[model samples]
Target: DAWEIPRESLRLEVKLGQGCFGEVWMGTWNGTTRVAIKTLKPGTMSPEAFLQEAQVMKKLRHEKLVQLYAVVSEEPIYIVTEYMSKGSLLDFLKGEMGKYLRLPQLVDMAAQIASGMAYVERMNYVHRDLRAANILVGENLVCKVADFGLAPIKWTAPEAALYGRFTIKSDVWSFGILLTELTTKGRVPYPGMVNREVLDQVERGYRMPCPPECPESLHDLMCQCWRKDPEERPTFEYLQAFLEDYFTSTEPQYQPGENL
Candidate 1:
């Protein structure tokens, strides 16, 4: 079941943004509260993917999960979600201000992301594509997970999809990649490496290099997450608890002229 939107009653103002699967437009609800409307291109994949997205979204209520305000047009469907003014985490990483994010700031962002992921884990769902580009930061630095088009349920059996079956463990893999993105300030997981090359390296048990300035503990955590064996990855609950402790014990300071 999907929450239907009255397209005739609402006017959609298109915004320019490109994503992996489709284009996104800025939409307004009743002349207030900006929302992003994403129209998935036809034949992108099996209709089952979109149907699964709508079903999962309708059942989700976490602050982190991109809120699905309504759905428009089942045929060539468009999903209406809460507007994120700041755009993707990749955008934030590219910002001049983002260059100044200190270790504490990074920790804070990681904690918030973990909090959001924890919420998803509780609901028995996993965000397969948890890259920096998929996370959006709102005013006051509130982070929300966006782009569920690739999110899939944790299948108990083997299945095939673009990236293979989605599982809570795969989200852990994405978290590792996201951590690298944050630390590198938008560097792709394996710069200059193609998909086949990266996969070949992964198959051969190669891990991406860690950021030089990242703390040993955090780097170790990330390494654990990126392990070749999925069972070796830590659960979101464990990661959240660890981050909560780290945040509570450290005093975050913002100093100018110092590398954060």
Candidate 2:
């Protein structure tokens, strides 16, 4: 293990988060710049799969998307990304400051997030695991989309799960769940329900409740995003445009109850 970057060159640091396959750690890059390193487990993924994700991220250029700093060591393979000091949407929602995020503030943040997602959508990429935890907030309230380990490269054609196929519609579905998380300050939808139960309810057309103070427009938009028929879900571009118009036209007076 000593060969894995001399202990002096690499200072082990814990990440405040976890994902399906690996643990992320904050580390110093070249003993200077701060970077978030995602280390995947051996044999968890094929080389082709890893390469696909790395290639896509390396080619992406957007202000709202987290930058891929570099990939270290082909033998073990680790991904380095720009570190965000403010943590994630999930952390913020659960912290003491959660209640202060009013309706207007949520809209502003959501719009900015949607704009970033729109950029990724335009490039024919989909964030399969879009969630509050994946959205990192940085200086000036800027939001950046992170975590591409589970992202799929293509989804147009029918394929097996083993091939890692994911679509834009799936991303929209994830986004809707995230919106719910944001409005409720990280409350899980259908709390206590298992994945199978949730899926069954979804199949039966069950709808999640929106926060009382949430604007009807946004509620409706999120509903559309979570439509069972993937084709019915609006594109990120459409959602982003609508949010932009809503924030621009309305006065910044919309405020949620103290419950938020």
Candidate 3:
């Protein structure tokens, strides 16, 4: 019921990407403020569900979380947010971008996301889906977590994957998956394994090997996060602590890449 944006003020320029329930359009508010406007398709998304997601977005404010700008509740539901020009983290890590990113900078990427998730966890919210595709990259190659839709099978934790249960612990499990993705520079989790195979392998406690680029300590931490028992997963506080501790101690040099 707050922050209703004037429809006329929003001039949609181009389609940005798709969301869990809507299509994201690159928009300009008053022809200046660049924004990502997600419009729920006709009859595809319910009003109540959209409102709940909006409420979640409304309460969140951090460098790691995507910035929600306004809500346009009219014919079709809409949510306006900060536009990440660099696009999804998955795309950024695909080709030339992957080679440009240096070793130490991975520390920064993981830490910022961990810091952001730490805030979200403190707020008692669970990001049901946390994957590389959902994350966005900005200038200076900063990572911002995005996409709040219910996740598919791949990134799910064991307890959540088997049962319908979800908790901060399950979220932590997914965070570990994110760390692995970061280590692999956005490659698919458990490469060469099918979805069902992954489920069976994880069910049997056979976790994927650590990414080659991951630091020894970080790899151990990732393993901790992937523990089968939800209670065994490390808290986001621990994640943020370790990432920060590693980055600070290692003092990895950061060089903002070219033209991106």
Candidate 4:
């Protein structure tokens, strides 16, 4: 209903990656502002559904949440958002830069995500897929949750996987897996287990132990997020407060190759 970016107004530079429903690019808007653009693919999703969901994303505005700058509602629609130069947190953490990140920074990044989710919870929106890949890393290692709902079996809450139920608490469940990724430098959760295997284990109350070298502080929070009962999980607001306190109280104790 507001700004409609003309096709010519966007100068596509590099292909960032593929999103759940579109081709993503790093583009310049009007040859001025750098933006991350997502162009919807044919048959990937119905326009009505896409736009309906887009409306919700558009309404979400927070520093820790990726900002939706504009949308082209017409055919070959495009969604433009703030560019995170460093790209997704998954890639950033798996790259050479990952090795240099200290324990404090990892905790800080988790705190940033929790801070964003706090706002998301207050808005009454349930982010079904909250994972490392959907979180973007910008300048100064700032992290922002992006593309509202997208996740894999590994990140799904057991109840959500079995019953098709979804809620903010399910999001909390996913957050625990994301923290595992953060500490493991983006390794897949339950490293050697298949989907069925993971379900079986988790169903029996076998939570994946903390990643190697992960401090107890972070793992304790992960445990809170991984509670079997959705209602038993802490709220994003509370998680944010807890993480913020932990990040501030702790020093940079772990180096690139430091052990717990």
Candidate 5:
């Protein structure tokens, strides 16, 4: 059963960011445990939908995933999760710190996410939303998947965008877009292109050019994820294995918190 946290036991502090449906805050539970509290904005979703999300998160247990600790299912839903101190990967990458992350470190981030998505795939769930903003950075530079189902035109696969067909393969395509984000240190996918332009070009089999900093092997992997046939895209398991091996072989000397 899911733990129902008392509304009184939580103390909200800093407002982290406005999520897809609410404002996420850095808070404390019972004056002890640091946690992330997302207060659902009224009318954003029905109580049933909120509870359903809680249900899905309750069953997904993994180190690479943000842990759902409890919920307040009252008039205004409050979702409590493990605190990811470093916040969203998208924001992190766009910050000054991103300039300092080495290529190996960036690959490590992707590897960790692939490991988490692999778990999701094994559990038979498709992360309809797989973008940089949904990935959280925790202590020791650990990256965990958070903020489940959502979207953006650029991060969406062709089938999903054109036909509303959201499958695991579609998630792979989004992962490729995420690789672009990582390689560019958080630039928007298809910079300067509007949604219509992007959709048009993608329909014509256009893929974004690899970032100058991205290695050919990694860019090739991104292209593989963008394969027109959904079945041809790599699974999370395969991506995880490939990324892990690549990270191990490159062996960058920079540590997670070490200054360059």
Candidate 6:
């Protein structure tokens, strides 16, 4: 029912990076088409669960999201996807590119991520992990949420981190943290504090102020996402729409007149 890529159909080009429960690399199909290949780390992953989740991720297709190309689905188990040359969003924001990024661009990137998550939310699946590092950057700084792993303690919602429960609301909370990371160009959230301090602070209703360059309205949206009550967090649909408007409405920086 899903795409099943035969091993003989692929050609390894270069090692890319590691992924959830696997090692990833750049490869080719039919000796021409470019692709990213991920192989399961021997005995450290769930074959059945990997296949099941891969199926869902494959079907949750959107332009702003990464595309799944094929899967070994059996012997020598591996997964293949469309190559994203630009690497992870966190790296993009921390590298030389971050220095040139403007306010509108940062917001645009956030919106792009929200657009993907909106679709994920529509399908009623929780991302569990939605940090900046997990987002993939394509050409032209286009962002897509990838690496569907569970939250790290720093990015995990207070309730989800402490309890076994996770839901879309927890995902919203994760988004708030991710927004902070992006706005600050990948600075560690809750600086100088350990995870224990963060956990207690979150439980006691502490929240970070907006990042230096992040706009007030954007900070408000982040606050909405950080609402302690799961029922109180804004839906990804609402967040996406608002961010789109914010991006479009931002005027370009002024330039000196050249009326000669």
lDDT of each: 0.72, 0.71, 0.79, 0.85, 0.87, 0.81
Residue-level lDDT tens digits of model 1 in 1-260: 34786666455687758655567888787677678887777767455567677777787788776788888756677778888877888889879768777776677677778888988888888777777877998887777887676661111111222347568887877787778777877776777877666666666777777686776677788888877667888988888787667645433332334554
Q: Estimate each model's TM-score.
A: 0.82, 0.80, 0.90, 0.93, 0.92, 0.90
User: lDDT tens string, model 3, 1-260?
Assistant: 66898788888899877755778888898788988888888677677766777777777889899999998877677788998888888888776778766546676787888888888888888888887888888889788988665426678898888887888888888888887777777788888888999999889888768566455667788889888778878888888877777755543543344411
Badly placed stretches (over 4 Å) of model 6 are 149-151, 247-260
- Superposed Cα RMSD, model 4: 2.2
Which ten-residue region of model 4 has the weakest summed lDDT?
251-260
- Clash total of candidate 5: 0
The numbered model that scores best in TM-score is 4
Residue 143 alpha-carbon offset, candidate 5, angstroms = 0.5
Better of 2 and 6 by TM-score: 6
Query: lDDT by residue for model 5 over 102-129, one digit each (tens)?
Result: 7778888999999999998998889998
Superposing every Cα of model 6 onto the true structure, what RMSD results?
4.0
Q: Is candidate 4 or candidate 5 better by TM-score?
A: 4
Whole-model alpha-carbon lDDT for candidate 2:
0.71
Which pairs clash inside model 5?
A: none
Supply the TM-score for candidate 1.
0.82
lDDT (Cα, tens digit) per residue for candidate 4, span 1-260: 67576788888899987756889999999889999988888678777767776687768889999998888888788888899999989999999899888767887899899999999899888888899988999999899998763327899999999999888999999999998989888899998899999999998998878778787767888999999999999999988887778745643453445722
Off by over 4 Å in 1: 18-22, 40-49, 152-165, 247-258
After the best TM-score superposition of candidate 2, give how far the Cα of residue 91 lies from its true spot, in angstroms.
1.8
Model 2 clash count equals 0
All models, RMSD in angstroms:
4.4, 5.1, 3.4, 2.2, 3.1, 4.0
Q: Count clashing residue pairs per candidate.
A: 1, 0, 0, 0, 0, 0
Error of 3 at 56 (Å): 1.1
